[PDB]
Amino acid sequence: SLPKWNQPSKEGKKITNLFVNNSLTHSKVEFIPQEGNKIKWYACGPTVYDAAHLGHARTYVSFDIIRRILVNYFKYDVFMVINITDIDDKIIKRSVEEKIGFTELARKWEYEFWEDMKSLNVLLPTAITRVSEYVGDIVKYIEKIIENKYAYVSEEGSVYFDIDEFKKSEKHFYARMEPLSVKKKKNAYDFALWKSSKPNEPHWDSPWGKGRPGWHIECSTMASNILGDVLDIHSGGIDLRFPHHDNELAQSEAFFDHSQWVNYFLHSGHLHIEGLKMSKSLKNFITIKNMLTKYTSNQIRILFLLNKWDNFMNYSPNGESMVQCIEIDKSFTNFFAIILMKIKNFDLNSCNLYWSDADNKLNLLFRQTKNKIHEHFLDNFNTPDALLAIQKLITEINIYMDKEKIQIGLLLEIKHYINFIFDTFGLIY
Template sequence: MTDEGRKQGDTTPKLRFYNSITKTCEEFVTRQDGVVKWYVCGPTVYDSAHVGHARTYVSFDVIRRVLSEYFGYHVVYAMNITDIDDKIIKRACELDVGDLEKACEEVATRFEAEFFEDMAALGVKMPTVVVRATKYIEKIRQFVEKLEQQGFAYEANGSVYFDLQKYKQRWTSPVFVGADAIDETEIATEKKHKADFVLWKKAKENEPRYASKWGDGRPGWHIECSTMAIDTLGVLDVHSGGVDLAFPHHENEMAQSQAFLGKERLGESRWSRFFIHTGHLHVEGCKMSKSLKNFVTIRDILKSAGPRTLRMLFLLHNWGSDMEFGVQSLEYARSVEQKIANFLSLCEARGRTGSATEEDAAETGDAILLLKKTRDGVHEALCNNVDTRRAVLLLSDLVSSVRKRAESIDSAVLAMIGGYIRRMCRIFGLLGGEDAGWGAELDVARILCKFRGEVRKFARERRPHSELYKMCDEVREELRQAGYVIEDSGDSSSVRRRV
């Protein structure tokens, strides 16, 4: 664990997650001390990713960072890419290419590359491992064959189905939804029971296919993830995805994976200890989705809102709850982001200029107590299902309180407060290696700032050179237009990036 995680993690509160399986908030305990084996359902790469996808993967990126950088876990984070699917085939058919299999590969390759470019733009860390369905065909076939040998699967008309009734005779598996629920897209007359789901699909005419003992076909939706997750990580600590994957996908994954591994390996434990799901992202009350044609692509939204603003928007909502996406929520996120960025610039400027102008021991003491209260509150929030909304609001309140009396607080204490906020922002992914986007441009801005301060001082000492003040104002305005704000305090000036 990190120093802070070790120090605070030994006392209550303990880290807890809402588990979609048990529908309760449980203490987070991994199978191997200090290690998290986490499998996340990645995208089906047939089109551009939208803001709903951004919400899911940024949220998991934040949780991953909190687990590793705050609580000190070693996180092994595996993601799958579904690169063969009905939607990919449909998109490939639209290309009107003679070789459909090649067209499917082109579609999947193009949109997978675009997806990871979007994730990089959002500051989402690359997975530890990326696995693709088309690279696992042989292992998927072997997985299905073993289920059939165990009596959990049966062949019908060239397709293979999972026998859910047989499974329930041997396993008492938690379910995410009611027992009578069914995925309507998989109704087939040859199934023994309406809730049975397909493991291997009989090939249709003119679509990609793979040879098998049951005839040509391709994997079902759920079997891909089980095969890749078990091959990569084995038994899991965390499995995650959007809430729309809870049923049927994750419930079916759980059943076939536990049947495959058997009680000999699992005992009375579950294949994955935790399932966590992000909530829907709504636009005007409706879920953002491609089928409703109410989606905004990640690339389009990044033209009007920066990646930090978008990340802040998601941080300000509980990741497991539905959220409304719109202009007002974006503007609020931008205001919080700017408020914190301005405060960090203030702390940095005070670090260069030295002591406060009116240091007050009482104000400094109050600031120290407020920092401790905030640290405790943020720790409690992160222990409570990684409640980033509460954590960010506490940081924002700390900024508001300290900013009003910054000139009265000891510089070392102000630097300590700024350092804590900067660390939490870095953990949340709001700051990169260049400290919130400040690169070589900052050096130029500081030189100009210093020059401007010297000119102002010269003008005050050698009146009536009022033209020099005018020059200073012109420089300040030019820098503002270039993206920098200069603030004057007594005989000194500080610079920050305009957010």
């Protein structure tokens, strides 16, 4: 009578002993691919009606880092999909007051969104799926949900998910991740898959009449069509856990008539500003473009690296939060300057190369750091502690370069390792 989770079998799968905080189990569990070393991942994208703000940046940069860890560090094979919500009540209302038109507006703010991602060094996904391009597939998806007796059609022409029918099934549980958050309709908790459209509203043809997709049906449709019956990872901010993500699971479970559409559901914590979530609704937001007029990409990525992806974070404006980010950015910059110049200008003809005790000591700390970072990454993508490991290492390399006789080959190897980690962080020096 309470929801259960099935862990993937380990037979035939890439095993790293990675553990992640899974919202389906409300706990840290071992990450195991559904197939081989493959990771099918779907991530909720923006509604393109306005600029993106620092809170959006927190989620997309945090999960960009995680993706980089998964691909660049652990050498998993990741296929990532992001939707663009270019049809929405919000897009419609903003397009009338601006009088610029449904599509011109969606395309404008989609452009600015990818430009903002580009500025933060956020990698593009393998696939981008616009809702406008998938309306035909949404209708076919909805039709099968009805064919499976888990959705019904109102007289106005709307289609609603039948929660009671879905629960009835022993194979299904509704609201797996937030159980306690639960005239035309059967039950008040039923939500629309297809919304009948007024003559003055944009609409699409359907077997049930002119209408528009409902709030959650799009994400289940596109992810199912591109990634199929089992997603390894589905991600988003914690606010989307209920009702958006829980409703995605009900739709996809109802469509495929199975019990687990997602193995691992990851939720980033919110960025708060003066104790409240950064939200357009609260008019407390800092745009990404505004943030880049005072701080660089490396500095902003360091800020997110310092805050565990799954915890809440508080941003103090006026740069109180960014002081530490700027100090770390400075130490990284100067470190690379010295080690690069020393590498480039080092002359072997004049240098004595005997492997000294200081060389042995630095090397030992270097290999210890590699292990500390590996354990940190396995521990739910603990970048704050991995970043500290790099800083401690750099403190000792700095001492060695200044005083000790330098083994050039050792310094090269150290530079290569730190480049590799910084590429995993998305830092660029």
